[PDB]
Swiss-Prot record, chain A:
<dbReference type="InterPro" id="IPR033647">
    <property type="entry name" value="Aar2_N"/>
</dbReference>
<feature type="region of interest" description="Leucine-zipper">
    <location>
        <begin position="244"/>
        <end position="265"/>
    </location>
</feature>
<comment type="function">
    <text>Component of the U5 snRNP complex that is required for spliceosome assembly and for pre-mRNA splicing. Involved in splicing pre-mRNA of the A1 cistron and other genes that are important for cell growth.</text>
</comment>
<comment type="similarity">
    <text>Belongs to the AAR2 family.</text>
</comment>
<keyword id="KW-0597">Phosphoprotein</keyword>
<protein>
    <recommendedName>
        <fullName>A1 cistron-splicing factor AAR2</fullName>
    </recommendedName>
</protein>
<keyword id="KW-0539">Nucleus</keyword>
<dbReference type="Pfam" id="PF20981">
    <property type="entry name" value="AAR2_1st"/>
</dbReference>
<keyword id="KW-0508">mRNA splicing</keyword>
UniProtKB/Swiss-Prot annotation, chain B:
<comment type="subunit">
    <text>Component of the U4/U6-U5 tri-snRNP complex composed of the U4, U6 and U5 snRNAs and at least PRP3, PRP4, PRP6, PRP8, PRP18, PRP31, PRP38, SNU13, SNU23, SNU66, SNU114, SPP381, SMB1, SMD1, SMD2, SMD3, SMX2, SMX3, LSM2, LSM3, LSM4, LSM5, LSM6, LSM7, LSM8, BRR2 and DIB1.</text>
</comment>
<comment type="function">
    <text>Functions as a scaffold that mediates the ordered assembly of spliceosomal proteins and snRNAs. Required for association of BRR2 with the spliceosomal U5 snRNP, and the subsequent assembly of the U4/U6-U5 tri-snRNP complex. Functions as a scaffold that positions spliceosomal U2, U5 and U6 snRNAs at splice sites on pre-mRNA substrates, so that splicing can occur. Interacts with both the 5' and the 3' splice site, as well as the branch region. Has a role in branch site-3' splice site selection. Associates with the branch site-3' splice 3'-exon region. Also has a role in cell cycle.</text>
</comment>
<feature type="region of interest" description="RNase H homology domain">
    <location>
        <begin position="7"/>
        <end position="237"/>
    </location>
</feature>
<protein>
    <recommendedName>
        <fullName>Pre-mRNA-splicing factor 8</fullName>
    </recommendedName>
</protein>
Amino acid sequence: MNTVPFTSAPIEVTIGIDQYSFNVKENQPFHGIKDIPIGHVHVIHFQHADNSSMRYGYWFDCRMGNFYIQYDPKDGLYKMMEERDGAKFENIVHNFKERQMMVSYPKIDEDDTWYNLTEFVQMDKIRKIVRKDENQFSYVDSSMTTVQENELSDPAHSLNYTVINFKSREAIRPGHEMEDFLDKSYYLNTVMLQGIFKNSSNYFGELQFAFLNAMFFGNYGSSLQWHAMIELICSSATVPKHMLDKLDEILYYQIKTLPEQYSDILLNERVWNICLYSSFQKNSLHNTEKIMENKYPELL
Amino acid sequence: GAMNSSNYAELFNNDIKLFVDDTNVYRVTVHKTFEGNVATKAINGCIFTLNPKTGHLFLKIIHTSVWAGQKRLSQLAKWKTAEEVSALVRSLPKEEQPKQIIVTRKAMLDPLEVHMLDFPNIAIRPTELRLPFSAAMSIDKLSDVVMKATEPQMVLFNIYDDWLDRISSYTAFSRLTLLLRALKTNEESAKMILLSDPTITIKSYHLWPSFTDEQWITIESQMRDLILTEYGRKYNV
Ligand SMILES: CO/N=C1/CCS(=O)(=O)c2ccc(F)cc21
């Protein structure tokens, strides 16, 4: 078990850790979150009480270093910062964990939600979508645009998700125009899986990461990317059987975890109706279809 | 974006553009089988690809063999249209290639866009106009070459005959769409108007009769009357 230590909490802020969240008052004595599970990536995220504009946060993995939060009053945000030292990161926290004012990462032992949302997500891949190589952790916020959005303006601050475009030469073989546009199997299996992603686990990893950025930060380009990666699978007649079964599980837990009041903006009617009811894989997503119908029957 | 009543004069400017109409590509007769079920029999069709400024018509005849052993023909027809339009563009010299292609039905947008990915700078546009180009097969010489074809064939026409010697493209297109709207609303009466007098001849190298200017005004009036009436005979007014 590992801990994210906070220098202090000078501005009132709602703090999220994975799917949990709690309110901290201005200058409340708060030095962190403990019992953070090893073996998964995590995200710690922030929404200031005064400006609900800009939800922002940090993807990190405790195995990759000792990470802490300190507020910067010039830039006006809680920053994740790195301190390599067992004669400092240990010498400072060992004092902080004698005075007990952290809440437990509050994991119910029956609960596999976070594992199920991050099964295929790996920090090394996050750090390639979010390019800032001097840090072991990755910053994302509400406003960051994606590479594909910028093609249609600061590159250093972009989300470099894999570009998917169904009406592109990458997607459409010359002479197979109609075939490839109505059955994207070529583009999914040859271009994307074998060529770009190398395997389905990397594909699912980016899909899961896009969903989580959409959910936690309201990042619109991430939501676009999540729906595009779903639609590319559902619109392929030929998908490995293991991928379909796993996709049904992935989507089930994402739909399960979505806030009920955010379905209006985070869920694209056209993609979901096409995927569950019109597409090649209409009959292959039983768990996802059942939860979508019992929880969001309006969208459909 | 889409073409409508507001940007109508763009059709006649000096940017090359083509209208593509696919309504006559896949044509069938419906009949009963010996067992009393219904079946279709395809007949020859055509793509109607028109330069509205110049009158040049690229009539690509769609021979029934192209459907043999194929499924979902109405969907295939749109992709076949787009394949042939894109082939036509590639066949034209660069300075003859269109800067825009306007499809008369919105279902052609995605098939044409995908077939034209190699031409990123040719705009594929829908239109809100209800153009009457389905009635092209009511022009006897066009119908005749389509039905007689025994293999795929491209036939070139000027759908304006010699009219541009005397009138502008705007006026020529207006006359054409009037004639075709009439032919579509009441073919028999439209054809009686045009062809009730066998001495106003159609030149061997033309599609329509050799009307004088004054006879064209009478003709056009008679076509308007027909369209207004049919609109009464239909809604009772
Ligand atoms: C008052 O804490 N100041 C600091 C900055 C120096 S550090 O890197 O050792 C550090 C580490 C963890 C922490 F929660 C706070 C601090």
